[model samples]
Target: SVSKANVPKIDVSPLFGDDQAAKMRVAQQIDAASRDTGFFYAVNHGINVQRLSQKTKEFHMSITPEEKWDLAIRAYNKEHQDQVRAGYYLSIPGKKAVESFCYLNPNFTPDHPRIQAKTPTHEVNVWPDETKHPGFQDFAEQYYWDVFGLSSALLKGYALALGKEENFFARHFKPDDTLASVVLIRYPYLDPYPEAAIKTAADGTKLSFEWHEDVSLITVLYQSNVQNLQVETAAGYQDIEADDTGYLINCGSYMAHLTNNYYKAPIHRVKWVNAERQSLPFFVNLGYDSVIDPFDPREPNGKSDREPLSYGDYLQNGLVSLINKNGQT
Candidate 1:
């Protein structure tokens, strides 16, 4: 059975200020939350919550059947190229419960050096025709940059918490070339299904999204005020409380790998609430060429024994694994 989990709610407003001691205080809170739960509510993170939420609703409502299929990832890849372009995707084929529209860095254009070189994550973004959707593309691009700014600020907190200089992570990311992606997810209400069609959790709740850990550096989520999300902890599965003004932040597998599990990557899932829901999660990634060198804070040099790995290769492998898991070949 699922119980309530008290995920830490940290006021991150101090990070935006010039006060060194105040910033470190917030960093220490992040350190404790990251180590214990791998999840937290980042309140006062400087995002325009109301505007973003309104825009998300408008964009999703405006999507037509024709537009949706035209922007489908499977169809788009088959017709255009075998790259991760902007498009809608179903978490599982033949399943209508969970779907998402994904887009990478908005600055990546066809003529950009990374896109020209065919970098895995630097593909040009495809959007609904601007003539039809009007400001959809503009709002999405702006939202991407807004989330990116917040994510970048969080990275500084992570660095300071781990005994590194605040700029330690900034060195690995290029403003225009980072592999970050924004996924706009929708969980529509579904009719009753056979028990065999859905996986029932230990607590007897049907799952819309199966239990799994994310594979980014961090995932910052702005979700509808729904009571369907759950997290796994030592006490077992616990329901997460939804908030309107805060972003639910969680460290991902890549972060765990880099920190040698000093920070956790908690397992989480969404329940089938039989109600409409929407979420916008920004998967924060470093530059394609960035190296994933493990860090040991206790060590004098802060270096670990693991061999460094390229972020690009790791991301590609992770995507392939997800595709395979979803039976997408």
Candidate 2:
């Protein structure tokens, strides 16, 4: 029986084969799951989590205490502040719900003239001096490509489920047209802290992350061993445990925009952490020029509630809103 509160786990092995009937059935299940919880798990998706994630784990641990903030903000005294590049962002444990730490798109080189003409938001990647963090650049980039392959296959499954060819959705991201980002977040649980930073919530349950949802095509979340993740559902908030063989997948805001609400973008939260937690989220996005127009399977005539908007505009405007809402004074 499908429980209202549980995020369904679907075996997607059929997606890798030539069986149309099997593939269609799995697709139907995916469509149904999307509508209901917009969150689920797929095992046997064929990514070597152990091999790919090891370096990332090490890289997170390599970050010294001093490197956990905007480079410009942290470098004002000893030397001139480095120019603000979209790279690593570190934070104090009490600064936010989860002590924020992430390095954005370290692989995206800014030398491409074609991409520059289209999206000005992209900047050269930033990283610590190479000598300090040996292999950080190489390992991070390799891990990204490995996960990128997995996401492509998963998106193809989505296309099949929506009654289209395997590449039905993948066509949006042509060569030089993808904007993928990998974020590494370490939500440190201080051994002892002020009253405000305690793990215990109002209900006395230890919690680390508050309620939130992602804003991209899809999000693949990999967490270290611990059980504190949960997704909101029709019944209530369902507890989600860590997975070794599969990724915890969820639809994001952009996917919802494309599917015209056929697939929901559900909200999820993390809380009650008794120990330190580390997570890696891969945010897959389309080229800046791609437009998010509604494509409802039910509406064959191509009708949708949303108007077409180029992704570049959406991103730029959204970034402004994010800064206004959350920027620290």
Whole-model Cα lDDT per candidate? 0.79, 0.65
Residue 226 in candidate 2 has what lDDT?
74
The per-residue C-alpha lDDT of model 1 at residue 46 equals 86
> How does candidate 2 score on lDDT?
0.65
Which candidate ranks first by TM-score, i.e. highest?
1
Local accuracy of candidate 1 as per-residue lDDT tens digits, 1-329: 44688789999888878998998999999998888767889998888988887877777777887787677775434764544546777444344556678898878887789878876756777788988788888999988988888888888898899988897886776667899888888766556643433567666778766778887888899988888788888877888898878999999888888887788789898776767777888988888889867987667787787767788888888877866654341
Q: TM-score for every candidate vs. truth?
A: 0.92, 0.82
1-329, model 2: which lDDT tens digit per residue?
21234567788778778888887887787788787777778878777778655766676677786664434322222342332324555454554434433334443465676435534455455666678778877776667776777777778778887777888767775546566667766666565644454444444555554555566788877777777676777666767767656787888777777788777778776665646666778877777787745788778776777787676666666555545643421
Name the best candidate (by lDDT): 1
Deviating ranges (above 4 Å) for candidate 1 = 75-77, 83-85, 90-94, 191-197, 298-303, 326-329
